[PDB]
């Protein structure tokens, strides 16, 4: 006889999918989002008169769960084509900048990536069962750098692939779990071209927030915003949920979809299992930030990688024209390498790559400083993948979702949707 | 004020998915199945002490819609013994058998398939928008054989790829549309290994009928069996449905999911659009059958192609052991090439492929003789794909689904589920 059948904590894709499932099963469903907005680690905004993406945005048809949702709600794709590049750059750890032919750049990144993932089929014949093979468990003792060191790459190739893997980690590659990379590669059909097609090619028609709103409208759930959850208590065959306004909401079941790195901010009674607490203390690796830079010059279509000891790890032209100048889209692997809110430091770092340009504006999202993400995309450290079930496992009447908890595309919208579907099923099993 | 909000004609995957979508939206939903069983062109049965699939059986995680359903209902995969093969054979049109080392066999089929689909990337960059490129439309004037004739393949390679394509066509390859094959290959990540992994490697835990029953139970719809629909009339802002007896059912909308080849047996008032009538007159090509053979000997893990003038076109091990012997799963492209219900002829042909074996049992399903399939899986003839919209288009309050009508994995369970999701969306738009 509680206030709700199910309470979903978190308004990202995982929470929205869980809420849709529970609502269409007829449960009285409430969703609590801590921010004043939905989307979580997806966030569409505007800068310098244009639309920009501060978080995740890109999807693909090889990603099963989000593609099935797009079919359900009749959403197509929007191509970010990019076409030919006018300038490809690599910045080594020592700060030196080298201009390379786009063709040679692509050839070298392909050689390095295919060497890194040469054994994806043998290790992950079932990418959605990461622990299927013993080889996966054995390789979860190795870092991405451990493998890179064995590949006999050239200096250029090594710098390129290390920059790429530091981006995927949001951290230095010596800490990055190797098997998660192989597993993502395998999810893309064990093939370089197919996987690369998923990276930054297609966005959702009507936007991530469009799909989230469609799901939440379909769900019929009550949706309360700016209501952060601070504690969960299991009692009376149910749960009590406290907000930061000391309010109490009771329910038969609760689905947690908050990012792993934020669990520290929530009290649980009874305490969570030891394995879950190990995960909660560890966190996930990524410390990334996103930055858009409006410069006066028209630099055309540019792309640059910077290795892990430098700040501007992924740079690419968002838009360009003589009147506009250029908007640069920049992903920073580790926030600590640059103060994105300092225009003089940002300008110095940008000019290191593009001499003489004048910075007209900046717009940044520091995902590590946001208390409701405390980090960016999901990136497993060494040894974490093989314990992932400890995080996925239900704890009585508390269920757990989120992209970190997915088996497939765990650094993506698709993994969040997967975890939401699973959480819906688990709610149905508990409530019948 | 009709008897139901929505009536779904057909108890296959498309109908079950449409019924699940409609039921979870709260519509009063009825499902009419003409057979005494559910599953349609999937059929879970038993043979030689084991569970078998007489129709569609194999799925994959690169198939978005059915994989998402499997996640929703908590179903894993069941691996058939395709890896590490002990014997790979080719039987040419003349009946001669050539045994090849499994690696050489796989290498040659890969060479032939990727040569056939060398331009899949350029022609189908968006496999779920088949008419996206002009090249796809222009190639829809060509047959699979038209291209095979340009490839200069070796004898083994040509026989392998022609057997594969005659199986997928259910017909001789001179009639098989080229673009649909390129499009399926593209759906499989544009590479042979990944595509082949999606076709005959993994089955559903608990069976196709397990997933069908899960969806239909979730839907809450009424399910009436042995009720064939003979006519549909649009009247009074709804539709009237006549059965084979004196029953009449009124509804706000009806979703037709019966196989294309059976529409000839159904009257429509008003008559359907000219394009849809053209499709209904043409039909689709497939004349396939399925056959399971239990032999006393333990053959291990076997795989064989037979070209189109022979009956045992696709052979692979279902199960094997010293006590059991072997169960062979055999897919026949054209029923007319063998009397699957005559066990002595089946034994003769099996021994033609595997000399000296002793046949303990046979179990077959002739999909072309069933009046409610009149053919097998979906196989497009020349020129049909570029007109597929004519088949997809709603006709007032009648909606059309089924694997033939899907955009992606159209020869598969996944395409059926896709069409069911689409039909759900269209019903929601019509009824609100
Ligand atoms: C910069 C950047 C770039 C990318 C990506 C991420 C980022 C940060 N990703 C990943 C993608 O954005 C991500 O994997 C999913 O959006 C994760 O969504 P979840 O629902 O799992 O968590 P998410 O963080 O979205 O949802 C959690 C929700 O819970 C809320 N919350 C937290 N604590 C709470 C509390 N105590 N009480 C209540 N609510 C609370 C949060 O505010 C948030 O709304 C991506 N993906 C992709 O597919 N393509 C891409 O290109 C990228 N690139
Ligand atoms: C032997 C064989 C083998 C394979 C496959 C098919 C076959 C026949 N396929 C293809 C796959 O099985 C197929 O494409 C879909 O399951 C078709 O499902 P639909 O719902 O579109 O039609 P399907 O034919 O399944 O459903 C239509 C339903 O409508 C009913 N019906 C017909 N007329 C009616 C009437 N007048 N009134 C009422 N009901 C009526 C039928 O009885 C049937 O139940 C496959 N796929 C895959 O993914 N993996 C595989 O391995 C294979 N292999
Ligand atoms: C996997 N699909 C879909 C259409 C027909 C097949 C098939 C392939 C090989 C053997 N039997 C059936």
Numbering used by the authors:
A (entry chain A), B (entry chain B): 51 to 482
The authors write:
Nicotine oxidoreductase (NicA2) is a flavin-dependent enzyme that catalyzes the degradation of nicotine into the non-psychoactive metabolite N-methylmyosmine (NMM). NicA2 acts by degrading nicotine in the bloodstream before it reaches the brain. Clinical use of NicA2 is limited by its poor catalytic activity in the absence of its natural electron acceptor CycN. The higher in vivo activity of NicA2 is due to the presence of a cytochrome c, termed CycN, that acts as an alternative electron acceptor to O29.
Inspection of the solvent-accessible surface area in the crystal structure of wild-type NicA2 revealed several interconnected cavities that extend from the si-side of the FAD isoalloxazine moiety to the surface. One such tunnel is in a region that is rich with the mutations that we discovered that improve the oxidase activity of NicA2. We previously determined that NMM formed due to nicotine oxidation remains bound to wild-type NicA2 when it is oxidized by its natural electron acceptor CycN9. By contrast, the NMM-bound structures of v321 and wild-type NicA2 are very similar with an overall root mean squared deviation of <0.5 Å and no obvious difference that would explain our observed change in activity with O2. The addition of NMM did not cause any notable chemical shift perturbation in wild-type NicA2, although the peak narrowed, suggesting that ligand binding may restrict conformational fluctuations in the tunnel. The major populations of both wild-type NicA2 and NicA2 v321 appear less accessible to solvent when bound by NMM than when ligand free. We have succeeded in isolating variants of NicA2 that are much more capable of reacting with O2 than the wild-type enzyme (koxO2 of 28 M−1 s−1 when bound by NMM).
